[PDB]
Design a binder for this molecule. Structure first.
Ligand code: IND
Length: 123
């Protein structure tokens, strides 16, 4: 149900957010696909914390396509799996443009948020 998904996301937020000096409005906006254009590293590294928590960012700091697909199939309602997978496919190479894995995580999520703002949700 959406409550199971939302509660899951809140859990990840609560584990990651305290470790970073994020601005409250900026953190809140991510849940509804509102991604600041050029935020400070606190918000970007929060996004990495979340990716690592979802187990989709490796130790080496790459975002795994297969692991993100699997998370999509497990966590999303059947009516949302298709756009999420299309978003992932559209944004799969965003990470190759950034050396810093906080940028990799943040701008890959931002890519997905820009691509499908009506559906994307971030912890
Ligand atoms: C940021 C970027 C890519 C991601 N895949 C799963 C979580 C996540 C967060």
């Amino acid at each position: 149900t959406m409550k199971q998904l939302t509660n899951s996301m809140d859990m990840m937020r609560q584990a990651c957010a305290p470790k970073f000096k994020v601005e409250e409005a900026e953190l809140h906006g991510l849940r509804k696909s509102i991604f600041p254009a050029n935020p400070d590293k606190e918000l970007k590294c929060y996004a990495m914390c979340i990716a690592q928590m979802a187990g989709t960012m490796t130790k080496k700091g790459e975002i795994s396509f297969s692991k993100t697909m699997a998370q999509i199939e497990a966590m999303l309602p059947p009516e949302m799996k298709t756009m999420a997978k299309e978003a992932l496919t559209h944004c799969k190479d965003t990470q190759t443009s950034y050396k810093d894995p906080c940028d990799k995580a943040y701008f890959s999520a931002k890519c997905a948020a820009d691509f499908t703002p009506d559906t994307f949700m971030f912890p």
